[PDB]
From a paper:
Subsequent work demonstrated that several arterivirus OTU domain proteases hydrolyze ubiquitin (Ub) thereby downregulating Ub-dependent cellular innate immune signaling pathways as means to evade host antiviral mechanisms. Overall, PLP2 adopts a similar, compact OTU-like fold similar to that of the previously determined EAV PLP2 domain, comprising of α and β lobes, as well as a structural 4-cysteine zinc finger, and a DALI search indicates the PRRSV PLP2 domain most closely resembles that of EAV PLP2.
To determine the residues involved in Ub recognition by the PRRSV PLP2 domain, we were able to determine a crystal structure of the PLP2 domain of PRRSV strain DV bound to Ub. Formation of the PLP2-Ub complex was facilitated by modifying the C-terminus of Ub with a reactive probe that forms a covalent adduct with the active site cystine of the PLP2 domain. The PLP2-Ub complex crystallized in space group C2221 with 3 copies of the complex in the asymmetric unit. Ub binding appears to be mediated primarily by V518 and V520, which interact with the hydrophobic I44 patch formed by Ub residues L8, I44, H68 and V70. Additional salt bridge interactions are found between PLP2 residue D463 and Ub residue R42, and a hydrogen bond between the backbone carbonyl of Ub residue L8 and the sidechain of PLP2 residue N482. Direct interactions between Ub, and a PLP2 loop structure comprised of residues 453–460 (453 loop) are also observed, with Ub residue Arg74 forming an H-bond with the backbone carbonyl of PLP2 E457. A comparison of the PRRSV PLP2-Ub complex with the EAV PLP2-Ub complex shows that that Ub binds in a slightly different orientation, with the PRRSV PLP2-bound Ub tilted further towards the α-helical lobe of PLP2. This shift in substrate orientation is mediated by a PLP2 loop formed by residues 480–484 (480 loop), which is shifted roughly 7.4 Å toward the Ub-binding interface with respect to the homologous EAV PLP2 structure, and which would otherwise clash sterically with Ub. A comparison of the apo and Ub-bound PRRSV PLP2 structures shows that Ub-binding results in a repositioning of H498 in a catalytically competent conformation, although there is no obvious direct coordination by nearby residues.
Author numbering:
A (entry chain B): 1 to 75
B (entry chain A): 413 to 576
The structure:
Amino acid sequence: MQIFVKTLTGKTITLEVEPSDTIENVKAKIQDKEGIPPDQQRLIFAGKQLEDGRTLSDYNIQKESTLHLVLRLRG
Amino acid sequence: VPTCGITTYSPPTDGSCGWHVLAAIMNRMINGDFTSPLTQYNRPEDDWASDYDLVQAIQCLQLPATVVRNRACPNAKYLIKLNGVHWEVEVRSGMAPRSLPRECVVGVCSEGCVAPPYPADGLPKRALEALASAYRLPSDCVSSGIADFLANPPPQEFWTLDKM
Ligand SMILES: [Zn+2]
């Protein structure tokens, strides 16, 4: 299925994924499309901050869904 | 009334800057003093606070605050920013606080985002106390600490002295 990922600059990436795919998989795909290291990626879905362990299924991310890509900040 | 210029709180360089930022937001809300009343607490890189930690904490304490990524949420009274590696916070003085949606808090909201007025009795009573009880935990646990406190708060006025 297709999902969309929106960067902070308002770019829209289109990904091919399965509901089974883990958040880590999605990050790896984003890297392949954008050259953003997973190390510094955080994915948001309707405000809910996604976590590496879980799948798209677990977060209810279906076809056509839009995620927001955010840069990890530590201070 | 329209105002100009930027009003910023920069925490000390103790290693707890993010938590000081939240503390200061609440300290201004409650007492008009835009600064941290938390006692300084030293820690290294591996106990720094993330945008994840700060977002969770903002939601627990129910603050009119966003973490600014790129666009600042127009409805956020308090703007949290990572300045290099130092968490700082700006405040919009001439503006009533607004209760922010989650996307607004996280700072991934879109042009047109809406938020209703923050209720006067809107800051959880003992929010600042909850943060004070929690902040010296590992940063990835601080929000859990706050949530636990607020959910089941110690009722005794001098509970800290009791616990000693
Ligand atoms: Zn917003």
